[PDB]
Amino acid sequence: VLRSVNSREPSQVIFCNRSPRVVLPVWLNFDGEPQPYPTLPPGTGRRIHSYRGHLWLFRDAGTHDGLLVNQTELFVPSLNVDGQPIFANITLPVYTLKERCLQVVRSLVKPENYRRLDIVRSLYEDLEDHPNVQKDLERLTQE
Amino acid sequence: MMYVKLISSDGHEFIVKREHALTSGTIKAMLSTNEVNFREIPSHVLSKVCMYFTYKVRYTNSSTEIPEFPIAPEIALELLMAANFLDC
Amino acid sequence: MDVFLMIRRHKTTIFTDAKESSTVFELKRIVEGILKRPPDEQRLYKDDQLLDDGKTLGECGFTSQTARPQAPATVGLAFRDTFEALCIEPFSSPPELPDVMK
Ligand SMILES: Cc1ncsc1-c1ccc(CNC(=O)[C@@H]2C[C@@H](O)CN2C(=O)[C@@H](NC(=O)C2(F)CC2)C(C)(C)SC[C@H]2CC[C@@H](CN3CCOCC3)CC2)cc1
């Protein structure tokens, strides 16, 4: 269900990274398969050529933590008005404290050593449940 | 506004807005005196939890660009355990 | 522009926000509603420097850069015929990093 539409109608977009992360843009192709695009460093913007009805999501390039674009999960280019580009402002979500702690711990501990940490077993499983695009697409489809 | 007192294991008293504290479903249940004691959370963790409450209320549903919530490596594991318990 | 503070005395820490343009005096009014002590019984400090009631918080050095929600700025408080000495007890010390986190 979540797939780009082959509109063939050009739409110019500014991918504007307003996050502290290196951002990976992800394009959902016409079969709903996610395709990675070039990364954007923190504090950078790029004018890119996309199409109306196309679907994009944004993630941390190294960790795949999910990011927000114009305050939501999915970005769909629309029609350009006045020759103005559509802005896609990529930002951090407000992560839960638990998820942010999981991010930092994963950043420090190799997955093979998660089970060495002195914490309850359910948190081993939470640490091992790394963020990933495919699961979020399934969550979004069901919504 | 209404304030609650959250007390760490080492006896530090943290006075925060109730609306901020209710970010944690655990704390809401513990409140429902106006004081909550955490026998397992020391102040170098609970102070950071209160900063998170402030951070969440300020930036949730905000269009300003959102800064990262910072967490030093030396507190990360205990803060994870507190966050798991507090459900926030 | 809002500023975000920890108002600290002894082993008490108050988390609150205020305007950069609001005054030290208006902040003591905040403290009064919470701690039930009058402004004339309060002394507020930035680091070791006592702060004048007329001065704005920004003037004292509390700004968006220094007083953020994630990293709040600390305002020292001393209560009183003699005002006590400013004393803020530090937070506890984190343990040593687990080896798998090194
Ligand atoms: C610099 C930068 N920084 C962060 S992103 C970014 C960037 C960089 C290049 C662009 C060019 N723009 C698109 O590729 C827009 C985007 C999306 O809308 C799909 N797409 C199309 O062009 C689709 N084509 C069609 O739909 C039609 F032709 C109308 C029928 C396709 C994908 C079916 S064919 C396009 C061809 C040529 C371009 C490569 C793009 N390679 C691959 C990824 O690595 C480098 C770039 C892919 C195959 C855009 C953004």
Swiss-Prot record, chain A:
Outcome (variant: L117P): In VHLD; type I-II; common mutation
Region (Interaction with Elongin BC complex) location: 96-105
Effect on the protein of changing L102P: In RCC; with paraneoplastic erythrocytosis; inhibits binding to HIF1AN
Documented effect of changing I119V: In VHLD; type I
Outcome following mutation: P25R: In VHLD; type I
Reported effect, L28P: In VHLD; type I
GO CC aspect terms: cilium; cytosol; endoplasmic reticulum; intracellular membraneless organelle; microtubule cytoskeleton; mitochondrion; nucleoplasm; nucleus
Effect of N17T: In VHLD; type I
Domain of life according to the entry: Eukaryota
Subunit structure: Component of the VCB (VHL-Elongin BC-CUL2) complex; this complex acts as a ubiquitin-ligase E3 and directs proteasome-dependent degradation of targeted proteins. Interacts with CUL2; this interaction is dependent on the integrity of the trimeric VCB complex. Interacts (via the beta domain) with HIF1A (via the NTAD domain); this interaction mediates degradation of HIF1A in normoxia and, in hypoxia, prevents ubiquitination and degradation of HIF1A by mediating hypoxia-induced translocation to the nucleus, a process which requires a hypoxia-dependent regulatory signal.
Record-stated family: Belongs to the VHL family.
Protein name: von Hippel-Lindau disease tumor suppressor
Organism: Homo sapiens
From Swiss-Prot, chain B:
GO cellular component assignments: Cul2-RING ubiquitin ligase complex; Cul5-RING ubiquitin ligase complex; cytosol; elongin complex; nucleoplasm
An example molecular function term from Gene Ontology annotations: protein-macromolecule adaptor activity
Pathway(s) annotated for this protein in UniProt: Protein modification; protein ubiquitination
The UniProt record lists the keyword Transcription: yes
GO biological process terms held by the UniProt record: protein ubiquitination; regulation of transcription by RNA polymerase II; target-directed miRNA degradation; transcription initiation at RNA polymerase II promoter; ubiquitin-dependent protein catabolic process
Pfam families per UniProt: Skp1_POZ
Function, as annotated: SIII, also known as elongin, is a general transcription elongation factor that increases the RNA polymerase II transcription elongation past template-encoded arresting sites. Subunit A is transcriptionally active and its transcription activity is strongly enhanced by binding to the dimeric complex of the SIII regulatory subunits B and C (elongin BC complex).
Protein name as annotated: Elongin-C
Biological source species: Homo sapiens (Human)
Swiss-Prot record, chain C:
Presence of keyword Protein biosynthesis: no
GO annotation, biological process: positive regulation of proteasomal ubiquitin-dependent protein catabolic process; protein ubiquitination; protein-containing complex assembly; target-directed miRNA degradation; transcription elongation by RNA polymerase II; transcription initiation at RNA polymerase II promoter
Residues covered by the Ubiquitin-like domain: 1-66
Subcellular location: Nucleus
GO molecular function: transcription corepressor binding; ubiquitin protein ligase binding
Range of residues in the leader sequence: none
Gene3D superfamilies the record matches: Phosphatidylinositol 3-kinase Catalytic Subunit, Chain A, domain 1
Disulfide pairings: none
GO CC annotation: Cul2-RING ubiquitin ligase complex; Cul5-RING ubiquitin ligase complex; cytosol; elongin complex; nucleoplasm; VCB complex
Domain of life: Eukaryota
Pfam (any one): ubiquitin
Pathway of action: Protein modification; protein ubiquitination
Membrane-crossing segments per the record: none
Modified residues (Phosphothreonine): T82
Keywords tagged on the record: Acetylation, Host-virus interaction, Nucleus, Phosphoprotein, Transcription, Transcription regulation, Ubl conjugation pathway
Residues carrying N-acetylmethionine: M1
CDD domains given in the database record: Ubl_ElonginB
PROSITE patterns associated with the record: UBIQUITIN_2
InterPro entries, per database record: ELOB (IPR039049), Ubiquitin-like_dom (IPR000626), Ubiquitin-like_domsf (IPR029071)
PANTHER family linked to this entry: ELONGIN B (PTHR13248:SF4), TRANSCRIPTION ELONGATION FACTOR B POLYPEPTIDE 2 (PTHR13248)
Self-association state and partner proteins as the record states: Heterotrimer of an A (ELOA, ELOA2 or ELOA3P), ELOB and ELOC subunit. The elongin BC complex interacts with EPOP; leading to recruit the elongin BC complex to Polycomb group (PcG) target genes, thereby restricting excessive activity of the PRC2/EED-EZH2 complex.
Family stated for the protein in its record: Belongs to the Elongin B family.
Name of the protein in its database record: Elongin-B
Lineage of source species: Eukaryota, Metazoa, Chordata, Craniata, Vertebrata
